[PDB]
Write a protein that binds this ligand. Structure first.
Ligand SMILES: *[C@@H]1O[C@H](CO)[C@@H](O[C@@H]2O[C@H](CO)[C@@H](O)[C@H](O)[C@H]2NC(C)=O)[C@H](O)[C@H]1NC(C)=O
Lengths: 97, 105, 48, 241
């Protein structure tokens, strides 16, 4: 018999988790912060009660892994533009990128 | 499991005397006890079942007592054929663990 | 660059609720004398 | 009773975010700088407005507990935070207690064991003890700090930040507050207000300074420029109406 909620609940199921892959672009959830990025080891020293780091523009740039308390750094996945360099089709059809 | 300590040990007494042995339990068990008789070179023989209950074919001198944790076996009159080994047993949980044992002579 | 894997991390699973011990019992209570066990403040895995 | 002036005290970490070498601007419940706080020496029941800042310049054993509630009767809950020599117990329990309770086995627990809900045991004049109690959105938050000070009657000159202790889901209401003196000797109480602050996180993430965004015009200028140093000139800050 599940006594329904009359006071804040204290019993429910465990929350599963995956392995910690590093140095690859991975969608990530760390105790509820969600985002996509590349996770790498960090030399930051958060105080004991501090979980995640925000920068000057208020963007999260670090998370502490919940199970092993290691500070990790979030760096955005590579993005940019592609340009084609050509000597003009009047001379050749060989290009560079 | 259940850890059950047989406090009495190798004991010496004359023939025809009161003898009492105790078999303390780690935690209380509701009189789920068995006493076993053992002789050297002989297979174990069932002696007493369900704490204080005598089995058929056993002399009346043996008697059991104790509730929860203070289980005890008492023999009013000692006999020369009574010089042998006694084994404890409990069957409250499924992990059925015996006792250390006691020696008589 | 597109993401390849997907990970989630959560604290250690600690303090499991002990309903397993009630389910496997050498002694079972009689129907008229039903016994109530209160499971409270623990992690309960109903998938087992 | 008497009043004493708080000299830039009552600042705490408002989140669990790590900021390095930043001048952050926050808006939350803080104790205004240079404010009068009542001085008590020995403790009747007191109100609880959005939280409270409690300072005690005593160490031995006298101050080891608090009680919280709105309309304390045999029906409403009550927070117990009484401290032992090696443990503390968090007992939010539905009871009432007799007038003038204290610690002599407790005086108020003669009937104060009624239909209780939640239990917790976590935490086991030379040192000043500073605490901040907050109750909001069904959550009770404790901030605490320990500082070695001497030869001060009012609060010491300096800056210190109050790290967070516990966040507990009591899920009840609290309006009255009282202390449980171990009657077998001075403390200070201040009220929080919604204020805007300019916190100065240093390299390691520790708050080093703060500015009250409404103290005086110069503080408003610093708060607008988001810097602790301004140079000669005229700066527009606010709007008069
Ligand atoms: C969460 O669980 C992990 C895995 O059991 C813990 O990691 C171990 O921690 C101990 C204690 O320091 C180490 O001796 C082991 O070497 C660790 N295991 C591994 C594989 O590294 C971790 O400490 C737990 N954390 C919390 C907060 O409970």
């Amino acid at each position: 018999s599940f006594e329904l909620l009359h006071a804040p609940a204290t019993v429910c199921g465990p929350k599963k988790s995956t392995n910690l892959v590093k140095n690859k672009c991975v969608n990530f959830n760390f105790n509820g912060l969600t985002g996509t990025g590349v996770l790498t080891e960090s030399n930051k020293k958060f105080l004991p009660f501090q979980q995640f780091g925000r920068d000057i523009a208020d963007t999260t740039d670090a998370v502490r892994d919940p199970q092993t308390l290691e500070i990790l750094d979030i760096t955005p996945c590579s993005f940019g533009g592609v340009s084609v360099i050509t000597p003009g089709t009047n001379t050749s059809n060989q290009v560079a990128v | 499991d259940i850890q059950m300590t047989q406090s009495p040990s190798t004991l010496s007494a004359s023939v025809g005397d009161r003898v009492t042995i105790t078999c303390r339990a780690s935690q209380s068990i509701s009189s789920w006890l068995a006493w076993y008789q053992q002789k050297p070179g002989k297979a174990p023989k069932l002696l007493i079942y369900k704490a204080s209950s005598l089995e058929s074919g056993v002399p009346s001198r043996f008697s059991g007592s104790g509730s929860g944790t203070e289980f005890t076996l008492t023999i009013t009159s000692l006999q020369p054929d009574d010089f042998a080994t006694y084994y404890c047993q409990q069957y409250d949980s499924f992990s059925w663990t015996f006792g250390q044992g006691t020696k008589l002579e | 660059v597109q993401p390849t894997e997907s990970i989630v991390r959560f604290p250690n699973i600690t303090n499991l609720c002990p309903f397993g011990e009630v389910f496997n019992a050498t002694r079972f209570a009689s129907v008229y004398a039903w016994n109530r066990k209160r499971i409270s403040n623990c992690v309960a895995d109903y998938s087992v | 009773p008497a009043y004493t002036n708080s000299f830039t005290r009552g600042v705490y970490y408002p989140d669990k975010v790590f900021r390095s070498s930043v001048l952050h601007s926050t808006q939350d419940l803080f104790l205004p700088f240079f404010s009068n706080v009542t001085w008590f020496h020995a403790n009747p029941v007191l109100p609880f407005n959005d939280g409270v800042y409690f300072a005690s310049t005593e160490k031995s054993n006298i101050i080891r507990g608090w009680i919280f509630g709105t309309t304390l009767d045999s029906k409403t809950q009550s927070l117990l935070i009484v401290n032992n020599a090696t443990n503390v117990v968090i007992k939010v329990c539905e009871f009432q207690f007799c007038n003038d309770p204290f610690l002599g086995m407790e005086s108020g627990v003669y009937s104060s064991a009624n239909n209780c809900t939640f239990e917790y045991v976590s935490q086991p004049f030379k040192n000043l003890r500073e605490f901040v109690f907050k109750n909001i959105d069904g959550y009770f938050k404790i901030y605490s700090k320990h500082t070695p000070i001497n030869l001060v009657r009012d609060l010491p000159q300096g800056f210190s930040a109050l790290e967070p202790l516990v966040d507990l889901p009591i899920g009840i209401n609290i309006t009255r507050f009282q202390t449980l003196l171990a009657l077998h000797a001075a403390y200070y109480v201040g009220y929080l207000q919604p204020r805007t602050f300019l916190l100065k996180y240093n390299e390691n993430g520790t708050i080093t300074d703060a500015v009250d965004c409404a103290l005086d015009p110069l503080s408003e200028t610093k708060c607008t420029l988001k810097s602790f140093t301004v140079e000669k000139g005229i700066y527009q800050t606010s709007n008069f109406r």
